[PDB]
Design a protein around this motif. Structure first.
Motif, PDB file in Angstrom:
ATOM      1  N   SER A  69       2.661  -6.948 -15.058  1.00  0.00           N
ATOM      2  CA  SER A  69       2.827  -8.058 -14.127  1.00  0.00           C
ATOM      3  C   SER A  69       3.053  -7.532 -12.723  1.00  0.00           C
ATOM      4  CB  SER A  69       3.955  -8.995 -14.542  1.00  0.00           C
ATOM      5  OG  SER A  69       3.628  -9.630 -15.755  1.00  0.00           O
ATOM      6  N   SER A  70       2.154  -7.880 -11.829  1.00  0.00           N
ATOM      7  CA  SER A  70       2.052  -7.334 -10.496  1.00  0.00           C
ATOM      8  C   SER A  70       2.349  -8.437  -9.494  1.00  0.00           C
ATOM      9  CB  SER A  70       0.660  -6.745 -10.279  1.00  0.00           C
ATOM     10  OG  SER A  70       0.287  -5.879 -11.326  1.00  0.00           O
ATOM     11  N   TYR A  71       2.005  -8.187  -8.239  1.00  0.00           N
ATOM     12  CA  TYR A  71       1.997  -9.248  -7.245  1.00  0.00           C
ATOM     13  C   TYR A  71       0.943 -10.291  -7.595  1.00  0.00           C
ATOM     14  CZ  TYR A  71       3.283 -10.846  -2.575  1.00  0.00           C
ATOM     15  OH  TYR A  71       3.793 -11.539  -1.510  1.00  0.00           O
ATOM     16  N   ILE A 121      -7.274   2.372 -12.240  1.00  0.00           N
ATOM     17  CA  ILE A 121      -6.511   1.139 -12.415  1.00  0.00           C
ATOM     18  C   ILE A 121      -5.023   1.454 -12.476  1.00  0.00           C
ATOM     19  CG2 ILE A 121      -6.093  -0.790 -13.909  1.00  0.00           C
ATOM     20  CD1 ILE A 121      -9.009  -0.633 -14.726  1.00  0.00           C
ATOM     21  N   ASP A 122      -4.241   0.770 -11.644  1.00  0.00           N
ATOM     22  CA  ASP A 122      -2.818   1.078 -11.502  1.00  0.00           C
ATOM     23  C   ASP A 122      -2.042   0.907 -12.805  1.00  0.00           C
ATOM     24  OD1 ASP A 122      -2.725  -1.726 -11.702  1.00  0.00           O
ATOM     25  OD2 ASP A 122      -1.325  -1.963 -10.034  1.00  0.00           O
ATOM     26  N   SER A 123      -2.395  -0.098 -13.610  1.00  0.00           N
ATOM     27  CA  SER A 123      -1.791  -0.255 -14.930  1.00  0.00           C
ATOM     28  C   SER A 123      -1.927   0.996 -15.785  1.00  0.00           C
ATOM     29  CB  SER A 123      -2.434  -1.436 -15.659  1.00  0.00           C
ATOM     30  OG  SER A 123      -2.254  -2.649 -14.965  1.00  0.00           O
ATOM     31  N   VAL A 145       0.831  -1.199   0.000  1.00  0.00           N
ATOM     32  CA  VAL A 145       0.000   0.000   0.000  1.00  0.00           C
ATOM     33  C   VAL A 145       0.868   1.252   0.000  1.00  0.00           C
ATOM     34  CG1 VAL A 145      -1.673   1.299   1.253  1.00  0.00           C
ATOM     35  CG2 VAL A 145      -1.958  -1.108   1.031  1.00  0.00           C
ATOM     36  N   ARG A 146       0.722   2.068  -1.038  1.00  0.00           N
ATOM     37  CA  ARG A 146       1.450   3.317  -1.205  1.00  0.00           C
ATOM     38  C   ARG A 146       0.493   4.492  -1.076  1.00  0.00           C
ATOM     39  NH1 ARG A 146       3.789  -0.695  -4.813  1.00  0.00           N
ATOM     40  NH2 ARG A 146       1.566  -0.778  -5.321  1.00  0.00           N
ATOM     41  N   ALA A 147       0.818   5.445  -0.203  1.00  0.00           N
ATOM     42  CA  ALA A 147      -0.059   6.583   0.040  1.00  0.00           C
ATOM     43  C   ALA A 147       0.742   7.871   0.165  1.00  0.00           C
ATOM     44  CB  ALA A 147      -0.904   6.384   1.294  1.00  0.00           C
TER      45      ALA A 147
HETATM   46 MG    MG Z   1      -0.442  -2.994  -8.434  1.00  0.00          MG
END
Ligand code: MG
Ligand code: ATP
Lengths: 109, 448, 55
Positions: B185-187, B166-168, B53-55
């Motif tokens: 390609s993510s976790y 969406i993070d992509s 988690v990035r904030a």
């Molecule tokens: Mg991600």
């Protein structure tokens, strides 16, 4: 012990529970059953449906060592590279053959 | 002769684990300047990553916080009191850890853990009674999960407005993405999303169920099998994740590099050796393929505690990344490989779309790599060579790295956060009360 | 010279043959008679073939 006292100091410094979250609405309380699984959530929907198997034929790799495998053992259903690994495969302890199939996702269940 | 006697002493790397290291006081400096920033131009940006988690604040170039989506909570029997933790404060010393996400899945499922993570996020951001929130979302996130996340944000934390993207796709716009094929390609997963006129064609996206989590799990199985007779160290998924990060790489010619990988000549260079911590008080091994596999060119004795406490990675250096390209062959995932997924999009799907203009050529000129699990060596080069064989000769194929594979999705969301495009997509609390948390504004970077 | 990716009839007999190599694909419209030459060789999809398109 000072190390243990320091450890207490760390967890007390790290703990969230001793901190009042003034931004949290005190009146709101969740539904306790909200932690449904993905299988349950899909079942309650009855798009997260998004791929299909390949039609290209599949390469054969040794279940023990991952090297290319010319051979499929009839007895234990393991793929193996050579006579050294066939010998080892036939001398596996009880249940280890299924443990090798599990890494391939091919275990008996 | 004894050829191993010619080899140098082996270089060996300590195990690494997810660990606690440093405290993080509440960053009230951030709250003060956030109040100083101009009206309608502040937001809290939460990249809701299953790995991290990035904030942070939209007006800043970096997240101020990067935290595993985990909590630990227990009653201490000796101090007589509850302790609660969220993130690296879980030391990841009882480690009663729970994770917000379903295993290997990009979807939040333990909402009490999720609330504890968000409480931690807001405390460290210095929220002390608010800003609107930008939340990254899984590519086809379940309606119930959108509903549950909305309820927490609006009813527990009262936030004025929320938007999901969406993070992509945020990563793509941060890197001047205009039209292209976004390969993430993510976790949790691997995605290929076509993007057209800065707008994603999510109806044509595909998910491979393999990602950086699955690589850590798979590497763990392979090590527990390699040393099935017994390894004294406590093998866990967290260690193999750092092994996959540090030692694995993509092969440019798998089944020819593989076929020679355990040959004794030069295996001293091809092997890499990880040391677990230890306490101290005519036919032989030199022709055994299993010795080379398990112990490399050196002789082995179980008397040496150090040598008993070390793993040799060997074939797993390349076998683990290759699951992305050969899922069924290497790990039994009945899904098309990455090159076949991306190829089927460019070859079959996009040229079938109405009004699409010069498909694939428009998309093909920018295949784009996103997400931490792309960072393997040769990942781009492998993908290029694979695509090149599927395309008409001379097609202008380019495969491109994101400038950063992990922070860049947050940077994109932060830059987008307060634009008029985003503020048209924001849902207000009253719109939530009207529509419920399942409703969402359709926008180029978000789900349908 | 390439792996046969496609062998589609396009005439009442003219084919399109798709050929693939490690470096790209190409499609060839086939004269009905060289198609029969390809058919007397037992060529199928997935075979590797050599063609002299002039001779
Ligand atoms: Mg991600
Ligand atoms: N240099 C690296 N090389 C290879 N893999 C890496 C590297 N750095 C990080 N990773 C891996 O990338 C993953 C982290 O990906 P990222 O943080 O982008 O995912 P996420 O946003 O949490 O994912 P998701 O969208 O699934 O929730 C982890 O599996 C991590 O081990």
């Amino acid at each position: 012990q000072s190390a243990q006292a320091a450890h207490q100091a760390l967890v007390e410094q790290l703990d969230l529970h001793s901190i009042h979250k003034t931004f949290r609405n005190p009146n709101w309380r969740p539904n306790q059953r909200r932690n449904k699984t993905i299988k349950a959530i899909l079942g309650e929907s009855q798009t997260n449906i998004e791929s299909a198997p390949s039609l290209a034929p599949m390469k054969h790799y040794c279940d023990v060592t991952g090297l290319p495998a010319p051979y499929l053992d009839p007895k234990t259903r393991l793929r193996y590279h050579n006579k050294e690994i066939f010998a080892m495969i036939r001398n596996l302890p009880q249940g280890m053959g299924e443990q090798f199939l599990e890494a391939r996702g091919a275990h008996t269940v | 002769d004894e050829p191993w006697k010619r080899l140098p002493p082996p270089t060996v790397y300590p195990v690494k684990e997810a660990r606690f290291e440093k405290y993080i006081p509440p960053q009230l400096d951030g709250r003060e300047r956030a109040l100083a920033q101009p009206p309608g131009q502040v937001a809290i940006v939460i990249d809701n990553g299953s790995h991290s988690v990035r904030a942070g604040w939209n007006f800043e170039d970096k997240p101020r916080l990067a935290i595993p989506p985990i909590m630990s909570k227990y009653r201490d029997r000796k101090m007589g009191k509850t302790f609660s933790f969220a993130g690296s404060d879980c030391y990841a010393a009882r480690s009663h850890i729970r994770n917000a996400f379903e295993a290997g899945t990009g979807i939040v499922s333990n909402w009490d853990v999720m609330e504890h993570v968000l409480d931690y996020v807001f405390v460290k951001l210095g929220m002390n009674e608010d800003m609107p929130i930008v939340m990254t979302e899984a590519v086809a996130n379940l309606p119930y999960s959108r509903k549950s996340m909305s309820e927490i944000i609006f009813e527990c934390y009262g936030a004025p407005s929320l938007v999901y993207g969406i993070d992509s796709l945020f990563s793509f716009r941060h890197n001047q993405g205009q039209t292209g094929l976004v390969v993430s390609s993510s976790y949790s997963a691997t995605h290929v999303i076509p993007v057209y006129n800065r707008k994603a064609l999510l109806s044509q996206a595909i998910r491979l169920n393999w990602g950086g989590w699955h690589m850590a799990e798979y590497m763990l199985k392979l090590l527990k099998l390699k040393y099935y007779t017994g390894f004294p160290g406590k093998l866990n998924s967290s260690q193999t994740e750092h092994m996959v990060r540090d030692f694995c790489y993509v092969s440019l010619d798998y089944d020819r590099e593989l076929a020679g990988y355990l040959d004794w000549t030069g295996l001293e260079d091809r092997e890499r050796i990880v040391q677990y911590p230890y306490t101290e008080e005519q036919r032989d091994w030199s022709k055994s393929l299993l010795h080379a596999f398990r112990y490399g060119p050196r002789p082995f004795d179980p008397s040496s505690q150090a040598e008993t406490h070390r793993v040799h990675l060997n074939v797993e250096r390349i076998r683990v990344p290759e699951v992305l390209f050969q899922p069924a062959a290497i790990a039994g995932v009945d899904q098309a490989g990455l090159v076949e997924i991306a190829g089927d999009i460019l070859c079959q799907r996009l040229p079938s779309l109405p009004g699409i203009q010069d498909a694939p050529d428009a998309f093909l000129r920018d295949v784009f790599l996103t997400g931490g699990n792309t960072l393997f060596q040769n990942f781009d080069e492998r993908l290029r060579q694979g695509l090149m064989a599927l395309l008409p000769v001379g097609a202008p194929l380019r495969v491109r790295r994101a400038q950063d594979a992990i922070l860049d999705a947050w940077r994109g969301a932060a830059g987008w956060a307060c634009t008029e495009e985003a503020k048209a997509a924001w849902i207000t609390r009253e719109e939530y009360l009207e529509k419920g948390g399942e409703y969402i504004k359709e926008h180029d970077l978000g789900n349908a | 010279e390439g792996e046969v990716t496609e062998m589609t009839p396009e005439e009442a007999s003219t084919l399109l043959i798709g050929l693939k190599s490690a470096r790209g694909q190409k499609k060839l419209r086939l004269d009905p008679s060289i198609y029969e030459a390809i058919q007397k060789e037992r060529v199928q999809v997935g075979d590797v073939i050599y063609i002299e398109t002039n001779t």
